[PDB]
């Protein structure tokens, strides 16, 4: 089941590490959670709908401003790239920051580089995280949003919440070489406890769908395996949208995609069929969840996974084996791969009482080492007072 430390443990760990690294007590502290997507995969960059929820796994940042004008960072996460420490001067008009080594610091460097407010002072900071790094629960986005929320303490920002999510997204593109969508940054910033967020990535309007049923559990199963094909999938969708004269696959419904089948590639048609169908499935999933129809929600999860496995082809044999094992347990409503795919985690919605047997059944039928997280919908990025 694997324990989830709470803000008190992470804050204390981060603050003890700060004292034993910089001599003084930290002056500021922030946290930003990871996320799991209940449904709506690879609709992100297609101006579609997603239904993520923030997790109890989070990244905590403690620090203090400096008069030096340098940034000094240390992270305690064991999976972090080596070295665990890095120091650099703040960017100027002449010289700007550039991505490099270690890779974990590029997320921090990107947000600093693209931070819209000034003057930004130097700072010392310690980073702690309970999000498994690169495990498909968007550890990077939690670090980007935590960094942004920390910098707001150094110098308050003026833009909208959407502008903050796009800054962290701009950091991921340039400093991490990953052309991701907006969901991970958005849900980390905007999550609310006991609620999933139906996010329209075209209008950035959000809808809060409550998930605070004690008889309901969300189970995260990390496959522990491992994105070469993610870019390619993005441009196949843009070519299909361009071929149909539309700005994005959000503007295309299944009937028009079927009517224009001969205007696009055979693979391109199979990618758009998932994207257009998945957008519709999340709208149906949100509605099913509002009225408490967990069985209908679970069936939409299974359709989403099979669609990702056959039409979008972004699943792997380990994920498919984890989903089929979970689907055999009654009291599991549905199971599905989450994140970009090619490994990572599977999300499962199930009855709370069935969680112990589900984990034993999933583990027994998996040809690897599966790690489990039982998570509730958590709050978004928040300032912590020391
Ligand atoms: O090389 C990769 C592979 C693709 C995914 C990705 C990375 C690494 C893991 C190792 C360094 C780079 N890290 C993240 N995210 C992340 N690193 C953190 C460090 C400290 C606190 C919170 C953090 O969240 N994502
Ligand atoms: O649905 C796939 C998702 O995969 C994530 O890893 C990515 O950061 C999101 O933007 C979204 O595209």
Residue numbers in the entry: 3 to 228, 233 to 392
Paper text:
GALK1 is a small molecule kinase of the GHMP kinase family, which catalyzes the MgATP-dependent phosphorylation of the C-1 hydroxyl of α-d-galactose to yield Gal-1-P in the Leloir pathway. In classic galactosemia, GALT enzymatic deficiency causes the accumulation of Gal-1-P, the product of the enzyme galactokinase 1 (GALK1; EC 2.7.1.6) upstream of GALT in the Leloir pathway. Inhibition of human GALK1 (hGALK1) to prevent Gal-1-P production therefore could provide a therapeutic benefit for GALT deficiency. Here, we determined crystal structures of hGALK1 bound with reported ATP-competitive inhibitors of the spiro-benzoxazole series, to reveal their binding mode in the active site.
To this end, we co-crystallized hGALK1 with two spiro-benzoxazole inhibitors (T1 and T2), in the presence of galactose, and determined their crystal structures to 2.44 and 2.10 Å resolution, respectively. T1 and T2 share the chemical scaffold of a benzoxazole ring connected to a tetrahydroquinazolinone ring by an amide linker, and both compounds are found to occupy the ATP binding site in a similar manner. The benzoxazole ring, mimicking the adenine moiety of ATP, sits in a hydrophobic pocket forming a π–π stacking interaction with Trp106 and van der Waals interactions with Val129 and Leu145. The amide linker and dihydropyrimidine substituent of the quinazolinone ring occupy a similar position to that of the ATP ribose moiety. Both compounds elicit changes in the four active site loops involved in ATP binding. Importantly, the quinazolinone cyclohexanone and spiro-ring substituents cause displacement of two key side-chains—Arg105 and Arg228—at the entrance of the ATP site. In our costructures, both Arg105 and Arg228 are sequestered away from the ATP phosphate groups, to accommodate the quinazolinone ring of the compounds. Therefore, these residues are sequestered away from catalysis in the inhibitor-bound complexes. We observed dose-dependent inhibition of hGALK1, with IC50’s (T1: IC50 12 μM, pIC50 4.9 ± 0.2; T2: IC50 17 μM, pIC50 4.8 ± 0.1) similar to published values.
